[PDB]
Design an enzyme around this catalytic site. Structure first.
Site, short mmCIF file in Angstrom:
data_model
loop_
_atom_site.label_atom_id
_atom_site.label_comp_id
_atom_site.label_asym_id
_atom_site.label_seq_id
_atom_site.Cartn_x
_atom_site.Cartn_y
_atom_site.Cartn_z
CE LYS A 177 -42.25 -89.23 -11.90
NZ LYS A 177 -41.59 -88.03 -11.80
CB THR A 237 -43.11 -82.55 -11.23
OG1 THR A 237 -43.35 -83.05 -12.44
CG2 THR A 237 -44.34 -81.61 -10.87
CB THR A 238 -39.41 -83.19 -7.46
OG1 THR A 238 -40.68 -84.18 -7.42
CG2 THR A 238 -39.35 -82.90 -5.99
NE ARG A 260 -47.61 -82.88 -9.86
CZ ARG A 260 -47.32 -81.69 -9.08
NH1 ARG A 260 -47.28 -80.48 -9.37
NH2 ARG A 260 -46.73 -81.84 -7.74
CE1 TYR A 310 -55.32 -73.84 -19.44
CE2 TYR A 310 -54.02 -73.28 -21.43
CZ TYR A 310 -54.99 -73.09 -20.57
OH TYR A 310 -55.93 -71.84 -20.79
CB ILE A 315 -38.89 -91.00 -10.98
CG1 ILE A 315 -37.87 -91.55 -12.24
CG2 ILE A 315 -38.54 -89.45 -10.93
CD1 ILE A 315 -38.43 -91.39 -13.52
CE1 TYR A 342 -44.78 -88.01 -13.89
CE2 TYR A 342 -43.51 -85.98 -14.55
CZ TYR A 342 -44.33 -86.58 -13.40
OH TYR A 342 -44.52 -86.08 -12.17
#
Ligand SMILES: [Mg+2]
Lengths: 297, 296
Positions: B164, B45-46, B140, B109, B205, B135
């Site tokens: 995570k 994501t980052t 999100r 989504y 992370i 994750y």
């Protein structure tokens, strides 16, 4: 002043057979929508499982929608959103090239753009085509909200952006939008509150229930647009039970289940991570369905 | 189970003139390696995974594997998708290119059910033979991998070794490790790195480690050594920067901080991500002055 696509619209399910798009069924379902008073169809939206279709299948379903609606008054408002602006621009351009009358473009999911980022995102999309663009706000799925101010700025700054499909359970925001920009086309993306949104000046719905009961959603919407609010509200009240059970599980799991139970699609197939509903939910949907007339082909 | 734990960095992806600055990318990874980091996470994501092309995805993973070759630093490649067929392909690809494992975000989504999430991750785990870290970031994705589903995946699939968590839910962190103490719980929320580690989490992370890799690595290793007094000390000191780095949606603040620190050449994002507000820019700049930023 703006070119618009409004009225009763259907977020089309995408039928699968043996893991592929059942293209004949897809066209047959679209023709059934056309014949029950629907004003526009939305291929490859959320209800159409856009996320799990290939780019080629994306194009096949838009083309089938365009071709099936030729020679009718029904328009194709093609799903073309992305959480990557460059991809959303490409999908908008493809949908235009494929003969779509306009595009529905969902707010970026997962990466949570700021209001400034959403504004630039949709401006880039609007600048890529010359057909109408309907914003699509569904924060429960995307993790982001298009603010009223951002929507109104986009409406005023971009010719193609003519309104928003709201799926946010927020009638306050619907008042906010049309009180400050009464020229925009507010579209309900939540079947249960179709009538309250229409009665406040909304000009259409993009419906899940219309997959199963297109005639009822069409009549509801046209009654409302004709300011026959009493007849519109009765249908909305009648539909509440089916409108709710169709979200017993994540859309389009219940609506595809209902379409299968009604014999309107031949197989209860999804693309992972979507799957068949629980047994309990399967039975609950069948129970609610028995109180309604489901038109055939 | 084979595992990838310790102090890990969710690498930002620097852009230069609209392309991935591959030289910058490799240089940033070397700085992470020289600062005690145990593994790097390319195109998470980052790293703006959503706006990278399939080629850019391949390229940054290749740079990471290849830059960490000959070091003890592992590559935990981002490879998730909200379409199971694609997540399987990304996992197989990541394996093919020498990743030590994959980070696979819960489908965003389309909101799969718990049964769908189980089948989604089951398909991924069976497609490769390298470790798979779940994750969970419901803010999100719009979905939550329940504790029961995570534990079932851990027990039913060999490659799945932990999760995570980016859910602000320390209750769930207790739930996970009390019922399945063999899994590797990984913190995905820098501000609460120490509380997760002190409850038996085995790594982070991190977003913050992009800017302060030495501090996050030291925090994590202190905690793994059960030096909780020193781990907490660093976690407390890092709260201000940890918090301001989410003033706006990650990675907007961290790229702003890297740019302000001279660690990247340009404050470039890929739309729909954009520069922060003028106010946030100034807030990030002010918080940074209290931390010592390692150079190259
Ligand atoms: Mg809690």
């Amino acid at each position: 002043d703006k070119n618009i696509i409004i009225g009763a619209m259907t977020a089309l399910i995408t039928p699968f057979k043996n893991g592929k798009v059942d293209e004949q069924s897809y066209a047959r379902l679209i023709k059934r929508q056309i014949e029950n008073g629907i004003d526009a169809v939305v291929p490859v939206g959320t209800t159409g499982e856009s996320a799990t279709l290939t780019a080629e299948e994306h194009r096949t379903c838009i083309e089938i929608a365009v071709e099936t609606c030729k020679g009718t008054k029904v328009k194709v408002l093609a799903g073309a959103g992305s959480n990557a602006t460059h991809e959303a621009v490409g999908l908008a351009k493809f949908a235009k090239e494929h003969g779509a009358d306009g595009i529905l473009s969902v707010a970026p999911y997962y990466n949570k753009p700021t209001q400034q980022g959403l504004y630039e995102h949709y401006k880039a999309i609007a600048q890529s085509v010359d057909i109408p663009v309907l914003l699509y706000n569904v924060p429960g799925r995307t993790g982001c909200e298009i603010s009223t101010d951002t929507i109104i700025k986009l409406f005023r700054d971009c010719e193609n952006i003519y309104g928003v499909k709201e799926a946010s359970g927020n009638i306050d925001k619907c008042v906010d939008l049309l009180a400050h920009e009464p020229r925009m086309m507010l579209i309900s993306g939540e079947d249960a509150i179709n009538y309250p949104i229409l009665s406040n000046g909304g000009k259409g719905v993009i419906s899940v229930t219309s997959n199963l009961l297109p005639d009822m959603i069409s009549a509801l919407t046209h009654f409302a647009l004709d300011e026959n609010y009493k007849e519109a509200k009765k249908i909305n009240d009648e539909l509440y039970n089916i409108n709710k059970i169709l979200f017993c599980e994540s859309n389009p799991i219940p609506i595809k289940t209902a379409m299968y139970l009604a014999g309107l699609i031949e197989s209860l197939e999804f693309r992972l991570p979507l799957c068949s509903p629980s047994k309990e939910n399967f039975a609950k949907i069948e129970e609610v369905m028995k109180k309604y007339k489901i038109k055939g082909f």
